[PDB]
Amino acid sequence: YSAVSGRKHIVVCGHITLESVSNFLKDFLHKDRDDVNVEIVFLHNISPNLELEALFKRHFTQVEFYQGSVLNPHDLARVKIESADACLILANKYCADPDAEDASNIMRVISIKNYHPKIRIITQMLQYHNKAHLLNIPSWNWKEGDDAICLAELKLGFIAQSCLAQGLSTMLANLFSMRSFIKIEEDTWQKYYLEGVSNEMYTEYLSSAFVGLSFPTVCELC
Amino acid sequence: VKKYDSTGMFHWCAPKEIEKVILTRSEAAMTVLSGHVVVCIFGDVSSALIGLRNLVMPLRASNFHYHELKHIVFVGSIEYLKREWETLHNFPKVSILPGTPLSRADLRAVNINLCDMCVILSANQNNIDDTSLQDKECILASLNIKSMQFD
Amino acid sequence: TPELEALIAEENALRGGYSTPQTLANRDRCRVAQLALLDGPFADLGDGGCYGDLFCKALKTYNMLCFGIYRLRDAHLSTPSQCTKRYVITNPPYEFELVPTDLIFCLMQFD
Ligand SMILES: [Mg+2]
Numbered sequence: 001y002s003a004v005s006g007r008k009h010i011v012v013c014g015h016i017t018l019e020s021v022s023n024f025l026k027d028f029l030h031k032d033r034d035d036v037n038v039e040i041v042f043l044h045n046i047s048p049n050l051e052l053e054a055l056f057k058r059h060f061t062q063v064e065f066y067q068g069s070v071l072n073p074h075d076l077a078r079v080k081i082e083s084a085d086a087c088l089i090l091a092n093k094y095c096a097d098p099d100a101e102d103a104s105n106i107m108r109v110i111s112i113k114n115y116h117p118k119i120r121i122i123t124q125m126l127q128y129h130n131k132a133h134l135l136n137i138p139s140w141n142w143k144e145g146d147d148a149i150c151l152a153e154l155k156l157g158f159i160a161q162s163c164l165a166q167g168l169s170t171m172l173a174n175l176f177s178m179r180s181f182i183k184i185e186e187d188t189w190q191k192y193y194l195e196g197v198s199n200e201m202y203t204e205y206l207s208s209a210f211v212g213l214s215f216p217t218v219c220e221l222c
Numbered sequence: 223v224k225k226y227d228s229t230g231m232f233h234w235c236a237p238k239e240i241e242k243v244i245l246t247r248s249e250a251a252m253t254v255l256s257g258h259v260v261v262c263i264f265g266d267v268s269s270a271l272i273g274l275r276n277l278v279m280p281l282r283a284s285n286f287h288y289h290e291l292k293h294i295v296f297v298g299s300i301e302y303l304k305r306e307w308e309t310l311h312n313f314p315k316v317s318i319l320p321g322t323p324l325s326r327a328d329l330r331a332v333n334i335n336l337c338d339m340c341v342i343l344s345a346n347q348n349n350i351d352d353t354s355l356q357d358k359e360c361i362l363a364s365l366n367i368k369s370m371q372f373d
Numbered sequence: 374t375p376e377l378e379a380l381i382a383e384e385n386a387l388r389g390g391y392s393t394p395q396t397l398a399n400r401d402r403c404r405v406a407q408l409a410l411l412d413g414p415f416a417d418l419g420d421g422g423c424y425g426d427l428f429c430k431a432l433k434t435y436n437m438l439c440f441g442i443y444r445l446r447d448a449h450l451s452t453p454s455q456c457t458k459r460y461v462i463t464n465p466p467y468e469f470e471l472v473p474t475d476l477i478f479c480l481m482q483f484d
Contacts, residue, residue: 071354103355110361133324135382136366142378165407165478167443167461174463189446189460196463216432327384 265302
């Protein structure tokens with residue numbers, strides 16, 4: 001890869017396959033987001049097949065591929081990880097044995113942190129107890145951005161919260177899939193639900209006019 | 223009273239039953255250990271048997287004054303240790319704490335911040351043919367101690 | 374909270390403790406709950422059908438935040454039925470019509 005001044009880029013490695021990449025890209029480059037200028041640089045040690053190559057050709061101007069292994073420092077230097085803004089890892093949810101997957105992911109994290117101790121990492125984990133091990137890596141600063149997503153914990157938590165009030169699982173899960181408004185004119189239940197689903201969640205610093213006011217007051221007037 | 227060996231080469235003592243040296247997390251807290259040696263193993267039932275006698279023996283040699291010895295504390299699976307306990311019973315000043323070396327509580331219970339050395343070994347390294355997963359335990363355990371925080 | 378984050382690293386479990394006045398101050402967190410418009414302070418608005426009015430009133434009165442409607446599936450059909458399945462509507466616009474057979478998610482206060 002050749003770094004381009006004034007433009008960030010990220011590095012994605014892990015379980016690269018057709019459906020996973022399609023889902024990730026479709027969600028990432030959605031129009032509802034603000035203007036984006038980040039290049040995506042994959043990294044895998046298996047030559048892609050024709051379907052995957054066709055997908056990359058379709059997203060020609062903003063996706064690049066490089067064959068290699070994430071455990072090799074030469075490869076890590078090849079994809080220019082020092083100036084990379086963040087590094088992602090994708091996990092195989094439908095694996096036969098969960099523990100092997102967690103072991104592989106932990107090894108990848110250790111290797112990346114060895115090569116560089118200040119990068120920011122986002123990952124996936126299949127069991128709760130395995131997540132505890134990541135707290136022992138010397139340079140795993142979770143006070144800054146360094147996030148592990150435990151699928152089991154989140155899933156069971158969603159269900160448990162649904163126990164108190166029903167429908168909470170759906171209502172939450174629709175807040176993270178960026179969707180555009182869809183209009184249907186015939187009158188059924190689907191119309192209002194489709195109007196609702198179009199929402200997402202965003203964060204932003206407040207204006208200076210609200211510094212001295214009370215929280216309920218500023219929750220109003222907005 | 224028999225103190226040295228038959229051949230006058232090592233320190234010797236009467237055999238002792240295993241339960242007289244097993245400690246608990248609370249129990250080891252009251253005892254104060256300084257300048258000792260802590261040994262971590264990853265064995266279990268049905269694994270290759272490394273001969274721990276060759277390790278402890280050089281420490282408990284002669285030409286060491288009785289007050290000059292180094293206390294030894296094992297940390298690991300009690301099931302594994304019982305298999306070879308008979309060989310090490312004669313050696314003096316040996317103590318065993320059941321636990322896991324990854325459990326950060328145990329490494330605090332024994333005063334690891336006041337130690338002379340900390341050996342880490344493996345047992346089933348030959349059994350596994352998966353190169354990536356080989357030596358995962360030893361690597362991970364070593365890094366754990368690196369990130370420790372002390373007052 | 375970070376305190377739970379740090380402690381869980383050491384022992385990977387929990388330990389019973391003793392209540393202290395500063396500790397009991399941690400029992401102040403909003404929780405999730407459901408309301409029914411059939412009866413209560415808001416039963417008047419059940420037929421009125423102004424989502425915004427309830428929103429402003431609820432927040433000022435009880436510091437309740439209401440951000441969803443869990444509506445009966447066939448409440449929009451003139452013909453009657455007996456199906457009791459419902460769906461979710463997230464963040465409705467200000468000028469939305471309501472019916473007495475409606476449930477709304479809310480965030481309770483503590484005590
Ligand atoms: Mg390009």
